Amino acid sequence: AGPSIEVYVSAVSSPSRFWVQFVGPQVAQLDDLVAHMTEYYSKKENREAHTLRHVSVGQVVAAVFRHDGRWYRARVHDIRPNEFDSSQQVADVFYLDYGDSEYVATHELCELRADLLRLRFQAMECFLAGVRPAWHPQAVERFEELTQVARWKALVSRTCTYKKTATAEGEKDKEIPGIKLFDVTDEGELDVGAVLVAEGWAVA
User: Fold this and answer.
1) Which of 21, 49, 78, 86 is surrounded by the most beta carbons within 10 Å?
2) Which residues pair with 9 in a beta bridge?
C-alpha cells in the first residue's frame, strides 16, 4: 500500500463499480483534448475524412456524448441491432476518460485520429472497500451525491484492498483497487463508505 492520492469521481454505476480520474496536469490536458476533438469532429469535412467504413468490438473511436453533444474517445464494448431500423445498429460505447457507458448509433461514430491516442486514458475503474450492499438504487444515488460525481469535486483516495482480473493464459492478472473515499477539510474528513454504512445502505 502507498500514500493517499487526489481523485475526481468521474463516473458511477455502483459503489462496486465506479470510475476515477487522477488529479493533476492530465486533467487540463484532458480538457484541451476534449475542446480540440469537439472542434475538429464538429466539422462535416473532418467527419467525412475519418468516416468509419468498418467497426469492431474493442475498437477505439471518436464518439459524441448524448448529454452535452461533445466528442470523446470511446471503446466499442458491444453491438446490437434495431428491430425497427435496419439502417441503424447501436453500439454500447465506453468513454475511456470518464468511465460512463452509453448506447450510440453506429452512424454517429467516426475514426479516432492516431495523434489523439497520445494521452493516457484517464478513467480508472475502482470499487469501494470494506462495504457490502444491504446494491439498492438510492444507495447508488446517495453515493453519487457524496462523491459529487462528474462535478469535479476533489476527494482523497486510499487503496485498502483489490480484486484480480483475468487476462490471457499466463499473462499477468490486472488489479482493480478497492479504495476508500474522503472529503477532507479543516473540520475533518468524510468517509463515504462509513456514511453509506451508517445510513443503513451498506454493511461493514
Assistant:
1) 21
2) 20
d(CA 189, CA 204): 19
Amino acid at residue number 68: D
Using alpha carbons, list the distances in angstroms from residue 105 to 41, 42, 58, 203.
16, 17, 16, 40
**Residue 111 near residue 136, CB atoms below 8 Å:** no
Q: Determination technique for this PDB entry?
A: X-ray
Q: What is the DSSP string of the chain?
A: ----EEEEEEEEEETTEEEEEE-SHHHHHHHHHHHHHHHHHHSHHHHHHTB-S---TT-EEEEE-TTT--EEEEEEEEEEE-TT-TT-EEEEEEETTT--EEEEEGGG-EE--GGGG-SPP--EEEEETT-EE---HHHHHHHHHHHTTTTT-EEEEEEEEEEEE--STTSPPEEEEEEEEE---SS---BHHHHHHHTTSEE-
Location of C-alpha cell 468509419 = 52
Q: Which of 133, 121, 124, 123 is nearest to 177 (CA)?
A: 124
Q: Report the DSSP pairing between strands 124-128 and 174-182.
A: parallel
Domains recognised in the chain with CATH numbers: 1-35+116-204 (2.40.50.90), 36-115 (2.30.30.140)
Pair 178, 172: CB distance under 8 Å? no
